[PDB]
């Protein structure tokens, strides 16, 4: 539990941009294995992650450091590449979102404080 | 060239740590599909990437911005998750190397 300037940047600049992205919709809430017909999803992906959870964690001061939050973004993208087929559209959507994420992390203010 | 603080950091901190890491050896050179019995590899992965390529690029000032080196690290790790079976050891190795990549990139100086 902290507020830092890098966490505020991950919340208000990085997450805000990804959330609104036209490819974001499959990532805004936990993967619903039942709705989507994916009875194997929880057998392959042991640490489900989604932007909903990351956003809420940011609002409830769950993270102590930015890096912890960046790690959750990474798990979410990684789950998607691991579980889905190479040819599924969701893989392209994840890769596009993940490039923005890396671009925006590159401009994160670097006085790590609060 | 002068090398921006960011590419300096990617070279002297990020690549420094990954290059010598005990999980690094499968990533140090381009995936050799013939050596590894992997006739489908280039069918699935259209942009192969590896640490040798990125290390050489950082050494020869091939890069204009950090974000472009960072993308190459990302492609390398993503290739690996996309091609390989979830249960493969290589997947666990890549996940460990990628966490270090992100930890370090959390402390990369500002641009400019």
């Amino acid at each position: 539990g902290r507020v830092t300037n890098q966490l505020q940047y991950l919340h208000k600049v990085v997450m805000k941009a990804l959330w609104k992205h036209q490819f974001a919709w499959p990532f805004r809430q936990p993967v619903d294995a039942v709705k989507l017909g994916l009875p194997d999803y929880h057998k392959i992906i042991k640490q489900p992650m989604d932007m909903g959870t990351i956003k809420r964690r940011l609002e409830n001061n769950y993270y102590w450091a930015a890096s912890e939050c960046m790690q959750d973004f990474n798990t979410m993208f990684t789950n998607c590449y691991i579980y889905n087929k190479p040819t599924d559209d969701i893989v392209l959507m994840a890769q596009t979102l993940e490039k923005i994420f890396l671009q925006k992390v590159a401009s994160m203010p670097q006085e790590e404080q609060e | 060239g002068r090398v921006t603080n960011q590419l300096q950091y990617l070279h002297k901190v990020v690549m420094k740590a990954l290059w010598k890491h005990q999980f690094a050896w499968p990533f140090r050179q381009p995936v050799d599909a013939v050596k590894l019995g992997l006739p489908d590899y280039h069918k699935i992965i259209k942009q192969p990437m590896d640490m040798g390529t990125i290390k050489r690029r950082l050494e020869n000032n091939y890069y204009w911005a950090a974000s472009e080196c960072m993308q190459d690290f990302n492609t390398m790790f993503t290739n690996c998750y996309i091609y390989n079976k979830p249960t493969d050891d290589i997947v666990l190795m890549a996940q460990t190397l990628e966490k270090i990549f992100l930890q370090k990139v959390a402390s990369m100086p500002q641009e400019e």
């Binding site: 087929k85 | 992997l38 493969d88 050891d89």
Partner: peptide
């Protein structure tokens, strides 16, 4: 589509 063939498991 799907997961290639892979490098080996554990």
């Amino acid at each position: 589509g799907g997961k290639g063939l892979g490098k080996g498991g554990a």
